[PDB]
């Protein structure tokens, strides 16, 4: 345990509807947005690069490429602004943190499947 009274106070905010993924997987996060007038959802699909933490303080980081420029995005895992997560692929890796992918592009930066 981390500590009683901390697992006992922050327990009503642990989500219980997300899938279970790993570093190396591919995700399609449906984040919610409030622009100038209304609520809309905007999808963000990339590779999971790291998960750290435990409890309500857990986070993960997914990485994509937009126009040749890499864009990695970081979320609190139980945040109430993720509408739903979907696991597209499940790649095969050998580390817990895929930090080496930051210096790679193209065929050098491909994660296997299965």
């Amino acid at each position: 345990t981390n500590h009683k009274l901390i697992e006992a106070v922050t327990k009503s905010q642990l989500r219980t509807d997300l899938p279970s993924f790993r570093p190396g997987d591919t995700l399609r996060v449906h984040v919610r947005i409030i622009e100038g007038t209304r609520e809309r959802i905007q999808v963000f699909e990339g590779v999971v690069i790291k998960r750290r933490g435990g409890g309500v303080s857990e986070t993960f980081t997914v990485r994509k490429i937009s126009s040749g420029v890499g864009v990695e995005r970081t979320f609190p895992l139980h945040t109430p602004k993720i509408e739903k997560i979907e696991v597209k692929r499940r790649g095969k890796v050998r580390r817990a943190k895929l930090y080496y992918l930051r210096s790679l592009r193209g065929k050098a930066a491909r994660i296997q499947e299965i």
Partner: protein
């Protein structure tokens, strides 16, 4: 985190390829800038043609810092490189195309012409 002597990549088609930061505007003694902030710079490398020439002293907005921005939700966004757009003192761009993605923090700055010319705003 841009400071004096930091070199950025230009992400429009105004003729410039690289700028050098001369001063971050804002207050007195102010040390660094980030996305949504306006710097004074100078063109170090241009493209043949275009209005902005090598050696000009211009103003630019910052887009895509490599140490990104934190949001009120505990969300973050980081980029792979630093970029900026040369602007016109009414806060409109000097070019007419914008390359690569751009951060959603440019709406509070009222740069509505930069966020609308750009491919996906993040």
């Amino acid at each position: 985190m841009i400071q004096q002597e930091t070199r950025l990549k230009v992400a429009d088609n105004s003729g410039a390829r690289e700028v050098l930061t001369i001063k971050v505007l804002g207050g007195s003694g102010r040390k660094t800038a980030n996305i949504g902030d306006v710097i004074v710079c100078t063109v170090k490398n241009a493209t043949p043609g275009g209005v902005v020439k090598k050696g000009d002293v211009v103003k630019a907005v910052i887009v895509r810092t490599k140490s990104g921005v934190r949001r009120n939700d505990g969300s973050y966004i980081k980029f792979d490189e630093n970029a900026c757009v040369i602007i016109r003192d009414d806060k409109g761009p000097r070019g007419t195309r914008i390359f690569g993605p751009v951060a959603r923090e440019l709406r509070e700055g009222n740069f509505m012409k930069i966020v609308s010319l750009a491919p996906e705003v993040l």
